[PDB]
Nucleic acid binder design. Structure first.
Lengths: 48, 264, 338
RNA sequence: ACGGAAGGGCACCACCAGGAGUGGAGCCUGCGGCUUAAUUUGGAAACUCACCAGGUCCAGACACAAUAAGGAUUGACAGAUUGAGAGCUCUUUCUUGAUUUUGUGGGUGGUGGUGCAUGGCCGUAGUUGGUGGAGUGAUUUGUCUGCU
């Protein structure tokens, strides 16, 4: 579980070239900062 | 005939770069499949190819598997006109052509609204049934533009009054409108004596490098002299040079007698 | 300017309000089906209407210089705080708020506020109500162009036009705002298509001039409903996105025509234009159709109505033909709501 | 498969030997472009004509309301108007027998798209697949070196 730092987006590998809308989480139990994917479309507007 | 002014506009953003994408690979890979465009989304490249294949800027080979392309004589044309517009020039084509044999004189609008002359270089104008694609119309006509282009720039740098080349990219040379009238169609002029005194001395100008014009007969230059169709010239190393001397001169010793009545 | 009588800007490459409600439902109903399609009166010249419009190949690709010699902008446009990176604004300001807070939390404070005797008559005692006082930040008083992100309420289905006034409570403060709606997309030039009404569900973006938030507070959007039930008919909820002055909304107007006779060049014109004056303005501007072709109607008669078009592509049938012109919209200033 | 190498042949839509020429002059015609209300389009004065400028005239199935046998409506030999053997209309009045008429609701029709849904009609010395044998298999030998 973690705190979201900011909302991002991607420019991923070929052939599927797009902006895929990941986020930045900092975990609680470590202080590590790991990127994270939001599932089913929409739902970036659910997180802040 | 081979050239076309119609479809230049209707390509989209990626197109010019996608149509460019085959060109960088062309020098190495002269047969370019579809993904070879990608690296250089999943909407982008074929909607360009849908243009490029159906608008004939890229040729298509039909197979069940992914198909290899090799860029088309039509495709460089706009790629040229892309960097053409991007140096700066060629806002629009003009209504006065300008259709020659091997080269296309195009009244063309530079930035500032300058009507000027574009020359597309490719031979044997009609697209021809007998050609192998990718080289003969592109690449032969590609190099040879600069071959001429840097002559006039070198020959205009001499200081003789002649046309100055404006721009060259990808077998397209652009230069001054150079208004005046050729002596091939010459209608009237009163004063030959220094006209031809310039002419016969214009020859030793042409000969100041140890060269001889060989096109100096009629159908070349205009009352500003305005001279054109340079490429045929002969060196001093060129073995037969002395025969061509009286050929050039006397043919323009010939002309005046008929039309404007003068003799040296 | 009006320099050039050719050449549109291209840069070549109680029950009466309810009848107003039925008018808004009608205009949104038709504006759903044929969106942005202005219907020219053939009697009136389509030049005077379309003087300020600028035609474009694509909104996303082109570039505007940010403002213009506008004069339908607010003149207080230069009286706006310009922001760089909003992230690099607000973390800096919260950073200064940490380092310069004299009042640590959990401290009792008698507070001395410059305050008019005009406003004592709305004060109540702090027992039967809640006089509570919220601090602000550095530039949180002063005006700049902002962006919200509207979404409709759950029960709500009534149409919302694009510049009707809506009260916005973002954070604590509450303003009366006549917004500017646009769909959310990410163009690199930050130039987005104006909305005339608002979508059924998918989250859009409002835009107006209001003073800045530096915390991206949530916001509730409503109109006051003084005659109704509880004092508000709630419309939507949303989130303060950022303060962007460069958020350029483009009003799209679509001129639509019919073809008559095919196979010849391509196509002619029925309803698109009226006069041969309509040529010179709108025929460097290209033209689209509904899985079809591109560009360059050419002149003919206009004496009855007909403009013999040229195109690039194949298919033509009992179909339509549509071009476009784009105009910037400009934000409106806002007021508080008490 | 490779517009890739090299090598063989063929050819007045190639060359040699020429021959008669064009391109140079004027003019006719065709294409582009330009202009134009339009110069239809990729052996034209009307017609052709698909283009332009004005002009009249017509449309409307069928369900319903109403009206209409105490007229719904068709056509009708002048003259005016309009460019006209236009009753379009009209000054009118001969005849019609519900065949229909005003309004609402309301539908058929397309030689419209598909030969890229099915029939039938009309015109016009090299290919291969079999059985072998070899290989687990892609594949191969067959389809072949020498002599006339």
């Amino acid at each position: 579980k973690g705190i979201v730092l900011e909302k991002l987006g991607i420019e991923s590998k070929q052939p599927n070239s797009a902006i895929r809308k990941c986020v930045r989480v900092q975990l609680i139990k470590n202080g590590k900062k790991v990127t994270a994917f939001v599932p089913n479309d929409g739902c970036l507007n659910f997180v802040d | 005939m081979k050239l076309d002014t119609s479809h230049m506009r209707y390509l989209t953003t990626d197109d010019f770069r996608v149509l460019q994408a085959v060109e960088q690979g062309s020098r190495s890979h002269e047969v370019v499949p579809t993904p070879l465009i990608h690296q250089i989304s999943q909407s982008g490249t074929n909607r360009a190819i849908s243009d490029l294949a159906k608008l004939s800027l890229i040729s298509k080979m039909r197979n069940v598997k992914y198909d290899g392309y090799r860029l088309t004589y039509n495709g460089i044309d706009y790629l040229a006109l892309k960097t053409m517009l991007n140096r700066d020039t060629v806002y629009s084509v003009g209504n006065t052509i300008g259709v020659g044999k091997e080269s296309d004189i195009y009244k063309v609008s530079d930035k500032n609204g300058n009507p000027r002359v574009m020359k597309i270089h490719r031979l044997g104008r009609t697209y021809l049934k007998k050609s192998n694609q990718g080289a003969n119309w592109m690449h032969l006509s590609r190099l040879a533009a600069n071959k001429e282009y840097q002559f006039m720039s070198m020959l205009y740098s001499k200081g003789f009054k002649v046309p100055e080349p404006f721009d060259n990219s990808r077998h397209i040379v652009v230069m001054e409108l150079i208004e005046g009238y050729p002596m091939r169609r010459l209608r009237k002029h009163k004063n030959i004596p220094k006209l031809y005194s310039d002419l016969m001395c214009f020859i030793v100008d042409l000969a100041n490098s140890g060269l001889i014009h060989c096109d100096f007969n009629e159908f070349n230059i205009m009352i500003k002299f305005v001279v054109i169709d340079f490429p045929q010239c002969i060196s001093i190393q060129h073995q037969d040079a002395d025969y061509y001397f009286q050929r050039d001169v006397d043919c323009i010793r010939r002309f005046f007698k008929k039309k404007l009545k003068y003799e040296p | 300017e009006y320099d050039g009588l050719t050449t549109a800007r291209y840069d070549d490459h109680p029950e009466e309000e309810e009848r107003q409600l039925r008018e808004f439902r009608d205009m949104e109903k038709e504006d759903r089906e044929f969106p942005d399609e202005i219907e020219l009166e053939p009697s009136e010249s389509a030049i005077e209407r379309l003087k300020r419009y600028r035609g474009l190949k694509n909104l996303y690709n082109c570039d505007w210089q940010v403002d213009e010699k506008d004069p339908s902008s607010p003149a207080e446009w230069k009286r706006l705080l310009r922001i760089g990176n909003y992230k690099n604004t607000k973390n800096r300001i919260i950073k200064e708020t940490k380092n310069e807070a004299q009042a640590i939390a959990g401290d009792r404070i008698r507070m001395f506020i410059r305050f008019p005797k005009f406003l004592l008559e709305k004060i109540q005692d702090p027992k039967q109500l809640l006089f509570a006082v919220y601090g602000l930040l550095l530039h949180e008083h002063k005006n700049a162009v902002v962006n919200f992100s509207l979404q409709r309420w759950e029960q709500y289905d009534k149409p919302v036009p694009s510049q009707e006034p809506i009260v916005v409570q973002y954070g604590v403060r509450r303003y009366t705002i006549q917004p500017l709606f646009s769909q959310g997309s990410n163009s690199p030039n930050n130039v987005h298509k104006y909305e005339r009404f608002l979508h059924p569900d998918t989250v859009s973006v409002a835009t107006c001039i209001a003073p800045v938030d530096f915390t991206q507070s949530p916001a509730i959007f409503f109109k006051p409903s003084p005659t109704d039930a509880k004092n508000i008919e709630l419309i939507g909820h949303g989130t303060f996105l950022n303060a962007d002055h460069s958020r350029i909304l483009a009003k799209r107007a679509i001129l639509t025509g019919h073809p008559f006779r095919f196979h010849k060049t391509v196509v002619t014109v029925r309803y698109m234009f009226f006069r041969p004056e309509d040529v010179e303005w709108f025929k460097s501007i290209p033209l689209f159709t509904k899985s079809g072709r591109s560009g360059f109607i050419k002149e003919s008669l206009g004496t009855h109505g007909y403009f013999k078009a040229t195109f690039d592509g194949k298919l033509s049938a009992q179909d339509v033909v549509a071009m476009s012109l784009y105009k910037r919209m400009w934000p409106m200033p806002s007021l508080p709501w008490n």
